[PDB]
């Protein structure tokens, strides 16, 4: 695989070559792959290879990364979340979004 | 996503934003998501987003979290288990 605009990777704290989970809101499929960086400003989300059996152009997905850390750090951890609307327009907050 | 009454999270040692497995006793589906806190005393189990394709209102589920530790500690480790009946009433 999945190629993602590098601006989107930076907003979520996801690295190139990191394991990611994709949860498809449209068709309900759930799969794991790895992240590839697409050109900054391209707004691309491209499912490549075997992953093209699990998503289609126009599907709405959630892309997540998971890390490990000790219990005391986990209890004060806050994840990096980015929210999207329209033409993959990114917001910092869920306030602006229609639906 | 899965929003869970914070009293339930406290009893099982599950944290907000932790990875959880959900095993659906009613329909047999098995999936992985993360935990969000719901209001204490609400007795809510809510499946949000893509996960709403894997469970319906009234399904019976088991929710589990896993941790890693050295073999020597694992040999005496004891998990936190909470048991439920009726309308999400904790025994």
């Amino acid at each position: 695989x999945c190629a993602i605009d590098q601006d989107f990777l930076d907003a979520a704290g996801i690295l190139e070559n990191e394991a990611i989970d994709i949860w498809n809101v449209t068709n309900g499929k759930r799969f794991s792959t790895y992240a590839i960086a697409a050109e900054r400003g391209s707004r691309i989300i491209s499912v490549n290879g075997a992953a093209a059996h699990c998503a289609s152009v126009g599907d709405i997905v959630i892309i997540a990364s998971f890390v490990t850390m000790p219990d005391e750090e986990a209890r004060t951890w806050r994840p990096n979340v980015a929210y999207f609307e329209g033409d993959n327009e990114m917001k910092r907050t869920a306030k602006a979004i229609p639906v | 996503x899965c929003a869970i009454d914070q009293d339930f999270l406290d009893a099982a040692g599950i944290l907000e934003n932790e990875a959880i497995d959900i095993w659906n006793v009613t329909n047999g589906k098995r999936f992985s998501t993360y935990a969000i806190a719901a209001e204490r005393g609400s007795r809510i189990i809510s499946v949000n987003g893509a996960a709403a394709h894997c469970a319906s209102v009234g399904d019976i589920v088991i929710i589990a979290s896993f941790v890693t530790m050295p073999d020597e500690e694992a040999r005496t480790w004891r998990p936190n288990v909470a048991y439920f009946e009726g309308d999400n009433e904790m025994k």
Partner: peptide, 26 residues
């Protein structure tokens, strides 16, 4: 502190797929 948790690091919430290519080489 040796007990290790698996935590949500980050997420892209409701992004839309723009391209799908079975025959990719990379």
């Amino acid at each position: 502190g040796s007990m290790i948790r698996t935590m949500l690091q980050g997420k892209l919430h409701r992004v839309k797929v723009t391209h799908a290519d079975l025959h990719y080489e990379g």
